[PDB]
Write a protein that binds this ligand. Sequence first.
Ligand SMILES: Cc1c[n+]([C@H]2C[C@H](O)[C@@H](COP(=O)(O)OP(=O)(O)OP(=O)(O)O)O2)c(=O)[nH]c1N
Length: 128
Amino acid sequence: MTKQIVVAGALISRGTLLVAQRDRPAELAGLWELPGGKVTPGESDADALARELREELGVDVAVGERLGADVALNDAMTLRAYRVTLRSGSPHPHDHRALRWVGADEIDGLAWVPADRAWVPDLVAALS
Ligand SMILES: Cc1c[n+]([C@H]2C[C@H](O)[C@@H](COP(=O)(O)OP(=O)(O)OP(=O)(O)O)O2)c(=O)[nH]c1N
């Protein structure tokens, strides 16, 4: 068996990180994540992530290098983050409850969705 991929983006602008507050499902609603979503059939990781961020945030990004380690979300799925940079737009929460730009001092204490917490040191490092 092979695992489905979920891609997430670490958008850093002016030394701060975009985080996004989920509105669904109930178990994650109110918690914060790196925005992204499931890769659909035929898509590269970059294609999927750029599409998700265009849909969720209304921005065009360039997809860069991996950020941190892959995370086993559950027995079916693997979550991967990439550094992304803003080419065009201001993020807007189409799907999320809220967005926030956070600096290094606000990464550890943020109410992360459980899976994304694994990336805290990587995110702090990328910001420092
Ligand atoms: C983007 C993302 C997603 N995560 C989890 C939440 C879900 O259990 C699964 C899929 O993410 P989701 O954002 O729901 O993907 P969608 O593509 O929007 O899901 P569909 O409703 O299936 O389209 O990954 C997660 O833990 N962290 C994170 N940064």
